[model samples]
Target chain A: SNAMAGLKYEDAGVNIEAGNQAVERMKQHVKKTFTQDVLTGLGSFGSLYSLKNIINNYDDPVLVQSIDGVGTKTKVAVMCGKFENLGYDLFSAATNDIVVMGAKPITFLDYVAHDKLDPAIMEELVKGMSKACAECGVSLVGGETAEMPGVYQAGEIDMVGVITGIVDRKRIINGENIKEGDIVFGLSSSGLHTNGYSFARKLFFDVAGNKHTDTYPELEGKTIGDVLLEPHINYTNIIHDFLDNGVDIKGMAHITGGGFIENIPRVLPQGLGAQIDKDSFATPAIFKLMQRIGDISEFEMYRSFNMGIGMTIIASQDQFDKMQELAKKHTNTKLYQIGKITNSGKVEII
Target chain B: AMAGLKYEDAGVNIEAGNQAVERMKQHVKKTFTQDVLTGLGSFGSLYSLKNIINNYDDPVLVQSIDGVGTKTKVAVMCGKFENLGYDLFSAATNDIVVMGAKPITFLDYVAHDKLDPAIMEELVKGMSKACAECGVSLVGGETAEMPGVYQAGEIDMVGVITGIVDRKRIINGENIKEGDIVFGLSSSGLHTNGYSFARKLFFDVAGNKHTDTYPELEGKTIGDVLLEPHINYTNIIHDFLDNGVDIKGMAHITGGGFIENIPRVLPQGLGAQIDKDSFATPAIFKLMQRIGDISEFEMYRSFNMGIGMTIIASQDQFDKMQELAKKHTNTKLYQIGKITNSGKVEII
Candidate 1:
């Protein structure tokens, strides 16, 4: 019931016309990530992807799905007005969860809720997403852009994503073969990959008296904003290469919100533990800066931040050299034989 | 550098997160079928399609994602949580079902500024209840407490659903012809769409509060009428197709209402002619039209008006479909109109 005559959806703060325009602008970028498997285009009520050609490749294919958000890292991006890499962070956070299980990513969907529908901002955010999806070889099939006037403040946004991947039953890496004396190889992260941001922001912005644009000697030549907004490194292609080359990769873990202490145990057997050498890999400068600024303990830093490792691969000691050689050929990031599996159930960093 | 720095000092309480998960565990487990392999703590949710794989020679995955829209604003204003949960589930489930697929699994994403256990439990309870009713499994969900992103009392929910259908049985409105009759299924109320305009008209222009009761609304509070849980049409549609009713095309009347949604299922040169007097307009819609001074066209374009879903079939099978719809408990069928070759939708 109303007393207004010429009222419309736009009058209520939701611009349907602008939403259509944003979708139109993103069609080209979205199409670049799509393979021939995407059966439907934009504007359909649902996204359809055919599994006919790929499903038969595995004897018993199991679908793995994960949903994740970028956490308070979004607050930093919004405050600094640096949203270019946030979509990659969102995509990597979700896709990495399944890829650790040796699953091949299929499709991705994003949910972006903001205070208002800004066409320019929407296009930029989606451009970043399409770029990341193309890099990972996954299709950006569908997404929702919700405009909530009161929920999110102006210039504040939250991004959530869901990804589905497939893994063959026999080939699924469940860490059952992980045993004592197994080598733990570490892949360097691109500075705090979507975790420990709430604390990092508090230390840098709230307590340490640092602005996003300020240049600090501790952060090398980059601004605090640039270092904080580093896009997450995608390990999908590297892991697939290891699988294809018949590397004896028993298990894999993506170091995220819980860092090494929590994430590493996820793939380990009940009685197994990892002994990581603290000096094995060089910690990134951003993490050391946060630790010093916050006066956080060594234990808390490893528990909260990823330290230097973004992912860990477990294999027998005999395959360590091969894992190192393959990492050099496929990825630009440094790799290290950081630790070994032990019989005790405690993760010890010496 | 400071001393005694911890994650809690940064305004995130891991204990609160654990408490919310503990509260939601029982409710989330009720929607689990035998196909689910893991519990709440896994990094990813696994659902086996093995049991149902035999039913389809070539299974294609169909997925849909949607939010409750500004309808959550009304729920928060009224402090009603269960209806909003049902609205979330029904909105996403209805979209997948209209594509002639059986909904198998669901994942929900909820972001709020603070973690309130009671409120979180209520939201999950409503979701589980709706999932059980629709025979869909609630495999996993993510709850984020972002202090700066959302306001303290404000919350937003998004639902992602995955369903499977045979490649040969996919329905994309390709089979509808000129002579097929259209059937309109009665909606419970507003049904989770058009809330932005509805709230604008009811609160801003009309100056009525959520507590206000209208005589035209049959003494129901404005909040009650606006917060009605969207009806789920999965079971009713499944029954019709199970009986081999030969349904040609279907449309789920949602955000775009009848004028935009009905035409989505029509062929390029085909159109729809719906008779305005074919069914009785619900009291909620009539009240909105009268109070808002909204034109007849805008009402049909914005709100569902009265139809929650529309089914297109050959005129010969109309009687059988209507008879089957009547046998269901919560469904009422109306023979609204027929498909036409005029190339434009006209609600005469």
Candidate 2:
């Protein structure tokens, strides 16, 4: 029954004409992510992708679907005005979730909503998303750029992606083969992005009284947002490399929102868990500063953030050694033999 | 940003996510069909098209993504959470179905400031209801309970629908030519577009409360009319397509309404002259027009204005299409326009 101020879409805010124009501008970015499988391009009611490739490619193909939001990390991105990487986080998180299940993403769609539509903000968002989609070899079939003023507060935006992937039933890496003797390899991370941003925001800006532009001595002249907003890595290529090379990859875990405590065990068999060596790889400087400044505990740090490892892989000693040589081929990331799979049935960071 | 924040203080607990998830189990389970290969707790939902893939000569996946928009604002204000799930579902499906897709699986993202089990239950309840109605499986959903992402009393719902259609039957506007008649389907009042302006018109510009029973709205209150659920056109659109209606092009009149959505289905070098007088514009939209002193062009540009979906078919099937539409669904199909050579949509 109560009344509140409502804004108009033209003079006050949301512009459909500009949205259409932004669609035109972003078409350059979106077109590169398209494979031959994309039948229809931009300006369609729904994206059309031929499933002929999928049907002919895999027998007993299991379609894996993942939907995820980039989390409150948008707050940091919005504060910093670095949104291209925010787009990376959107496709990266969703595709990574299913990639661990041995699914190579085929088609990707995004649902990005904001209080008002800004063509400039939209330009880089699609640019960043197209980068991740091309890297993962997914068809950026369609996206919904909704301009809802009251749904979000002013200057706030939310990014979510639904990535559909296809993998043959014979090739899925569900960790059923993971045994106690396999070694766990850690894929090094970019920074403390994705989940744990709400806490990071409160810890850095609210509790500790820091600005996004505030430079910490440890951050090497980088602002807090700059240090915190490093683009999320899309590891589909690396994971598929291990799969394609016959690495005997028993399991893989994308160390995501829940950190090691939660994400690792999703792949582990019953009565088996991972032991991560805390000293194996150096945690990024931003995580270190946040931990020190906020007085965060060791366990809480692992649960909330990916301390250093972005993903974890399990293999035998020789296969792990093989991976070590294989790891030399990629310059985008490095790997560490973080620890081992033990019989504890829970993750231990020692 | 509040004082003395801890891990427990500033953000979600595993318990909050779990409780909300547990409440969703029954609601999510209600949407499962034979196509679903896996259930709720999987890292990713598994859907198999093994049964339907072979039915077609060439199968193409048509998918559409849509959010509830600021229309959900009216629902939240009225404390009605369940109905907008239809808007979320039907919105995406309408897009896919217009291109002759039979929807198979759906994924949802519902985000709120903190996890309230009651609200989560209501939200998923709405999704499952609509999913069952459409014969779609609620194959995957992510419920985000971020602490600082959403403001208090605010929630967002977005849905993605993937439907399969035979490649030969895929409806883009390539078949559309001059003299093809355009038909309009009646809308069930404010189906998830132009709410920002409508709210401004009804609340800010006109100074009316949600509870106010305006004379023009008849017996319906301002909130009741604003929060009316989206009419699902998936069944009706598919029904028409199924029963020998050679529909050349179709457009789900959504955001950017008629002027923008109609041209989406029209091929290059071909547009349409739409006589706005021939079709009915809903009362609420006229109320919005008079209240805001808005231009007719702006009205067509902003809101659906009572036309929900559009179909362009040859003049030969026009009579059969309307007869079939009347028999299949309880809605009127009005001949609103005809295709032209001018490649520019003119709303006369």
Candidate 3:
């Protein structure tokens, strides 16, 4: 083709030897995450998996799929030269999306876009992505490495993950059981998860840098880079634990691009609302600083960042205490009675 | 924050996105048959072949991805919108064909800051045109209007193509033997790599007239030559497959050019030796050479040097493959060299 006329790996910023080296470095890490389900090696065009085991559990199963790109936070990773975190960030971003539908993540496909393909950097990114997938009990099945010379900036790149999962007819979790008086339990987010970065970048980096992290002494142990790159909290273990014990989790919401007020109500029934108290859970120091410096109103703050709550569990009043008890088996699970089902279709935050 | 930051403030126009999706749904439905189980508007596009599993003993899936690169800048600059879409589509789909896979379904991602209906139509039309010609279906994709990421009047175009190949027909370069002859297929023009440098040389530094046709290159506008889309070699090559041509290895000369790409298809203990005088050099390359005074070594290593496709096959299969290729595509085939029992590629 005409485009192939000028095709050269180095011209596109891709080092051929480095790309092979990156693959060599990652072969061990890639194999560590493999299960019996994988049918092909890493070099194939697409990763293959055996559906025999997953198909046995259901008489009729629906395959759920999602394709999501880890928005512009990748810019931050590139800026800092911290290539490792973005991979897991991509895995978590994609796997978490499908997990919300009550689907066990079966396999994942990743697309890594860079102006040039750096073998060392690619290796680190794949290792991190593979680790996250292995931990979530999903396979890093297939991926595409795109090296475009002028399309992206030298350090800039984008990561998109496509996930395929299976869910039985009876186990899909779309908040159908959510009812009045069912308490909302908030899971403690490790740090600012992968959302609102376009706005967060302005608040933290553009507007006021030091002021955002100044008040929090806990943050003194880490730099803004450290705090931001802290791997996003993975909720698969805790959520599945609750599911295994048959905890009546009427709904589960992954606090994503929209924070509580926006993302939570996505799964709610019509004419139902959530009344979340502002003071119920203490705002993390990072959120507080963002609010003070950006002069963003309380409503805007809640509508943006996750505010330290990564996942929200809507459960019956009867299952509230048990859910909390079962959640403790996992890491420090912050159980908060944030709100309840209100009559009007209005999410009121006070 | 300074440039193209108003994407969200100007509104992503979720409504407009939905409308475009509706248009795509109607366009894609015409290609449906019994094997398609999933439709549009789903989280992920699906193609079901459970009923067709009986067709092949071992089915393998082949996927390839590509981008239009800085060529989009030229299209945006020249307002020549018709060809850029299929340009990327052909570029991506051809990569899959190099693996001996039949093109199946394709998805495109168009990222821009603002919603330009005209531009969207041009891009989609290009994709649809190529998909129709290739006998493939355009399944699904995304349109990301990232306000801050792109400058005004600029956007990025990318494509992903997925195909299925019979396991036995998969071309992995494993069968390439030392004595196999190399066949180099002529490229149309600069298909799509090294555009940043090309732009720097032609438009930025040289200031050559776009319409001033060169004496050596008769009757061709610079834009015409520069914007010539990647050739769609699928139709021509599939004919080679049908006529019982045996191909030991194939390399889709892409971003790595001939110097790097050809080596990828050479077996572990084998290297390729190419005779430069075997094929005629296209005019576009001569212009690059005269304008930039680029070294011959750099020219051959940097650009594809006019060869787009490289096939390695035994002498027994060469006659049949050449005959099939001559009757199939508007491509010049040359016996460039032969595979030798060496580990590194050497150009003579």
Candidate 4:
């Protein structure tokens, strides 16, 4: 009992009731898109899903699991006292990692830790997460809540997610099929989708603070909240559709923490390089604003943030039109042939 | 709203964390298992293998993920903390167990913008206590600090449990028979599901406090009844096993309440019929009804109402199951209903 009493919420750095409210708000939206695969209900000690049918489809199906957090964009979540959108951020980060290996996200789990627990804030966070799951067609299966008193100050929370997905042995996207003619189709990102927020905070808040709000034209009408809370998009269905149509997509890369300069090269084959035209697409205004205020150089922008593209799909020349059309049908998602592969190992920016 | 004025600002409540940890120690002692490799306090927990369950069989590992529902809200509001990890552990473990798998390990991820070591320690302690109860090891977990997504003093808790079950023993809820009698285990209040709307109606709109007393309950504070931790049913289930009671089906009462969860455990062309009045409705429900002014239909669909779990047993072994549950846990579950050839749960 002595040890127990010493372990209370404030003592332990958690707010229990608040976390409960968050889960409650999240359930409504999360349950909307649950496919037949899910078995146990959400509130059980654990959520269950029927993997027998899908498990049988593969001769030797390997389960690829990944855990990721939304990084520092959560700082924006704290500043505004809003949480619903960060769920999408966490989901996007985790699923993007899984999709790189051609894994179809089977289940997504989340963890939220805070100095104190608040029901209203948690509810908002869950609402965002549930909405993202419904949109991406991933099961918003389950997650954890932590109210840490000493570890976190009041009003601060962090989100991390673990995703389990399955990929067919024959269909994994490892960039092995890359050749000289494969056109790189750039998919637009919704501005800083869960990455590079540490540097962003350093530039936007610590150095420039709110003063830059007036200095930059791009941020004129938008609140700092609007510019920062953009949700990341998951390309599960589009990529799957491309595969169904036999798009011969040589490689795929989720432009996340490392941005294009680094992330895209991971999918490049030996002795092969990519030539990207900087003028190929219009960068979102948010990036330009950060550049103007922070005196960010061109190289810094491309290396640190996704700029506009969230994902890059490398496909053969023959399937270009059909694959691009398939992507457009989903969410007005713009697809641009931003670059092409070459015989050299260097990634050149025009 | 007036209560908001009692303090100039809302900050961490030190006393609540202490109380919760105190409450969990007893539950932890009851559930301790011998094989667990490490106690609490390390970044990752440790577990050791005894005998391999099988030598020739290719061991397929099953994993279950979960989180308690709005029930955490009540725990927070009432400043009641300990039982939550018990409920969360049970919620995740039971799901894995139904796959006919013995839970091997668990990993938890807790992220916050700020750090509260005391509250975190208690939460882990509660989790360790529950793991001890369920005979599983709390292996590893991640703690993250992200400061922005949550308000001061708010968090989202989640768990992932991995277990192994022989292919033959997995219960897909496919074996639920037409004549199997459904025995309802009485719930300890809401049992960690629902409460998103419960709060809106009772506290948000009703203007109540954690210390408020309701007239419907002679002298009990509303917080006392509301903070009742979810009762882990693993102990009793293990007892049933020891007694040679054969349970055809099991369903942990959770979100979607009984109406939806019970059906998951049934075969096609079969359903359940629960007699709602069979068990004594706890006072918490009465309080919810008065505060929300909600209809019985909505209440049944939204909340567990009272029952936490239901076990489907062979008609011949129904008496034995009940006897074991009562003798083992001092539980008097309801014979609330039975299985049917058609129709889903009819709760009249």
Candidate 5:
């Protein structure tokens, strides 16, 4: 076998040794997110998670799987070179999607695609993921790191997460009990929470000529980056506490890409709608700033952004005060009686 | 209220999305096995584990995530979108199958620079076809059109697969031992590894073009030879498993090739002794080696050369395993190696 002696995978832009180093750097961080149910380590071909704990908890368990990405909010994070909060955004968004269905999130998997394998960036990203998973009480079981040179640009990274949760068949929240006259409670969002970034970026950066570092008076001396980069709130324990305490939550909606107008309808039965009182709660200043500067309409603002509400809970009117007390006892955020379910098949805010 | 304010202004087209979903529905429905309880638009994908739980006393969930390396670049250049889907599904499902798990659900993520409805449909069609063939359901997926992230006509696809296996029957290479025979399974072609190096050799070192034909490749164009879809061994292996053929260990020869992958299944102080002349090396690999003047050591480490999967079995169960493997079409098994007490893999 006569051939060239020195050619290696490094020549083709892939460093296998560097990839291994990245894995090594992430091992300590990954170990913190594991529970006793995790049977295998990180380097296996696949991740092994035992369902014994979950299976023993319920008579008949239904596994709910949710897959989602952080949308263009990743573009904002990458542009600012601040990756510590990106993991919270991804993990919170995915876990919330399943928790709204009354499921207990058990495991998470992430996929990160970038131009090259940079060990520092990889380690930082997984650190954030490990921190969020530990906070949410879920195991960070598996992930894929793909270094595609031609696919992504130098500073561009796309992150996607898959969450697996379990709920009892009888206890599954399909929103069938969401009847007319049910009181709707709104939970405050931190900021943005991984949606409407494309439009928000265009308005803030291109239309308004504002830098990420620019601080405006209306924003209370906070930089544009500070307002946009707040980590998504983890509501797993609070929601679980409410459910365990017999709060009787009829339905819940995680305000994500579709905002209040579209997401509330997903949890409502046919011929039932929501009538939100816009004056009930004080909107966050960031929403006000974006609306005033971008000259965005109230209707469009409600449909595009969360309008400061991260989640909506619909319950019976008689249980409102008890639910409010439970929520206030568990979460630091203020709760508001945003609306009530109506017979009409539309969401109206007045 | 301002005029001309809509989500479409942000480059997300709802019309195009609905059309792609419509085109993908039929293909997705074909892979359903009655365990899938929800459709495409639900907030989360739902699969009932009642059947699985009833079948096994202790069911452990096995999940794997993978992407089709740079092989996607070849498909993008060749403008052949269909086979790449098979490559994605096969690469992911095979990883789980080798762990003695039966894949039940799959989720895909496709990020492209722009929305091309025809391209989207073709890509999903390939995925659905492969999932159906492997007895896996295409439960949910995400298609993102990032205008500035990817190059024009270049996209990156990642797949996630979830499977279930009886906890007692998990084949995690713990049973592998010295003196066990290592059988090599034939590969269709380079399967899904070593493309970046192979590409450099064919295009840069040899200066050969995609349209160029080689006599050693049976007069086939380079593109055809390079784009052959990876073979899925789920069906064949499931047949042997159901028939009670004893398999101690299995390794899917992927990106690491033999030098790195074969050792993954071997125990401590146990290595593999592979006879280089035990099987016929395929024509495409021989062509790459001759053109690039690659060393034999690098060839075994980079490319599968001929073996796509390695199975370890005791000498007593060897004849029965071979007979069961022959029942599957396009699959040939050879006794290419044996486990040794040496600490490192020896290729003679």
Candidate 6:
């Protein structure tokens, strides 16, 4: 008889009711990301997406998959008490990684873990993801939202996104034929673009001792948090326009976690390298401010921060003017002739 | 500007991250099959479906994601981690396999306050072992070191899986009728559910250490009993379906155990009448029930009570399933319940 009146799961901080409430509130925001390809709705145990049309359309279809997290950038948002728009950071980072392979992303999944499950906070995060997925034309099929108190500290949360895309085997560009004299066109980055947060956190908060609300003259009139929280620029639409519009993209590199010196070499073939013109495109003010405050070397800066470019493209010189025109055709992106392919066999800046 | 600071000075080790990627290659390669195309510098994973798609008439891809929950804390306390990878692998794969999807490719995301390559390598090693056995390619993974968010010794494991099933052959429970027999397949241990509740009951409520022995379990400690392998049901279940055994409705008994999962596969105006004494319950449950004084209602829903999966089919297929179970190694079968016309589950 004593067993009938004993402990339950609710006594151990695991709330099933709160989880259902979270799913209930997030339904409107999540349903908007679905396209016709999504076969299952939000409640299914496993999400189903149809790929029969893609299989029949392409001669040899390849599935491109990648997963990435927001890293320490979440700390800045949590510190600033702004998380509604943070889904863009997660979407941009995961989308850019697979799109560089010339793949058209079809679906996305996110795993959100926090100290506790809050319906209000979950709605905001999904609201942000809904905005990004709608912009990218991809479906947000399903995900897992966990409230683990002991695993994550108080006021801490982490999100990891998984992207599934498809491409023709022949159209995949891996820089296998990247040669000398190929023009390198740089795409403008919206500020840090979700990298170097470790150094940024150390320099601003620990070394320089600046509060998130304080204003700096170098940043014009914005507070430190305002400058650091610039949303990541998504280049999916522009890159697809270039591919569909007869621009020969020999190779592409998404300048991310490791900046120019490291990311540029990922696409370079053996016995070939890139010679970047550093001043060809203007550098962002945040990088300049960190450079002076930390007295960091030029080698360290290019290896860590994006300088200004969010993505780098390699092609023959014939397509140079065409890329420039496409930038004007698109509203939010800027194009510049940042450098060229060289046989010097090293990532160099003149 | 008097300071000369570098990225390494900010408590992030770029070189160590590089080394961790290099160390995972051997294990990653072990899970790769012919369908996995080599992309030396490709930004993401490339899986060719030129041959895989031919097997299905009209294929629908099924995807699911999961985590190990607080079970990692038990692995951390026991100072053993080889099976946690198997735990994550089986947990994610079972979710889709019950839907009659063949396991395809997988990706994992590991976030820790600081990256410890030793523990990371062990986790990957165990995952690769399970994947290799099941023929699921360990295609891609991400390791994030977030010092600001997590305290030290805190790691989170999240897995995403993709599989394929023919459209016409999908086994949804819409075909389930009344008087169908439901079988409860044996689980290795607690599987991946109820860790949050189990941890509290054992350590806090019962006041027992991980190293202490339980009376019900024969000469085994609490940690040893809890860390048993979460059994893989892919091969056996696939075998049964291929050899003319009819499986009408299926449910992977996971985090919510029997009550929450069994009903998910039932049609409207239908429920299950499960006989509580139909099969032998695992001893670990009896030990926890006695120590925590947990109610029968809480025990049936929170833990699997040794049932990892449930399958409902016609009563005529019982003799055939019993015969097929003997052919496959490490297989157990039980007819524990029946489908009811009422809309609520009744435990007799």
Count clashing residue pairs per candidate.
Answer: 3, 0, 14, 76, 0, 0
lDDT value for model 5: 0.81
Across A265-317, the per-residue lDDT of candidate 4 in tens digits comes to 88888789998887898798888877887787998788778888899988877
- The lDDT per prediction is 0.82, 0.80, 0.70, 0.67, 0.81, 0.82
lDDT of 4 by residue, B212-253 (tens): 877776677766666666776767776775578777778877
TM-score of chain A of each: 0.92, 0.91, 0.89, 0.89, 0.92, 0.92
Candidate 5, position A104, lDDT = 88
lDDT tens digits, residue span B63-181, model 2: 87878677777877888778787778887778788888899888999888666777777778888888898788888878787545556678887799988899999888898999989
**Candidate 3 chain B minimal-lDDT segment of 10 residues:** B35-44
The runs of at least 3 residues in candidate 2 whose Cα sits more than 4 Å from the true structure, single-residue gaps closed, are A1-7, A10-25, A42-47, A116-118, A205-224, B1-23, B39-44, B146-151, B214-218, B275-280, B290-295, B342-348
RMSD of each: 5.3, 6.1, 7.1, 13.2, 5.0, 5.3
Cα lDDT tens digits, model 6, B92-154, are 888888878888898888887778787888888888888998889988888888766775677
Off by over 4 Å in 4: A1-25, A42-46, A52-57, A211-215, B1-62, B65-95, B102-159, B162-348
Residue-wise C-alpha lDDT for candidate 3, range B25-49, written one tens digit per residue: 5555554444444522333344444
Q: Which residue runs of candidate 5 sit more than 4 Å off their true CA positions?
A: A1-25, A41-46, A206-209, B1-20, B207-209
Query: What are the runs in model 6 whose C-alpha is more than 4 Å off?
Result: A1-25, A41-46, A206-209, B1-23, B41-44
Q: What range of 10 consecutive residues in model 5 chain B has the weakest lDDT sum?
A: B36-45
The sequence of per-residue lDDT tens digits that candidate 5 reaches over residues B233-297 is 88877876788878888889887688888887778789999997897788999988888777887
User: lDDT per residue, candidate 1, A1-350, as tens digits?
Assistant: 32336765532223446446766777777888877777883263235788877677876777788888877788788778878888888888888888888889988888888876567677777888888789767888788778776678776777888888888767888798899999999889989989887877887888888899886668878899899899888888888877878888999899887778878888898899999998999898898888787677999888777899999999988887676777876554677889999998988888
Interface RMSD of each: 3.2, 5.5, 5.9, 12.0, 2.9, 2.9
CAPRI docking class of candidate 1: acceptable
In model 3, state the lDDT of residue B148. Answer: 54
Better of 2 and 3 by lDDT: 2
Best by DockQ: 6
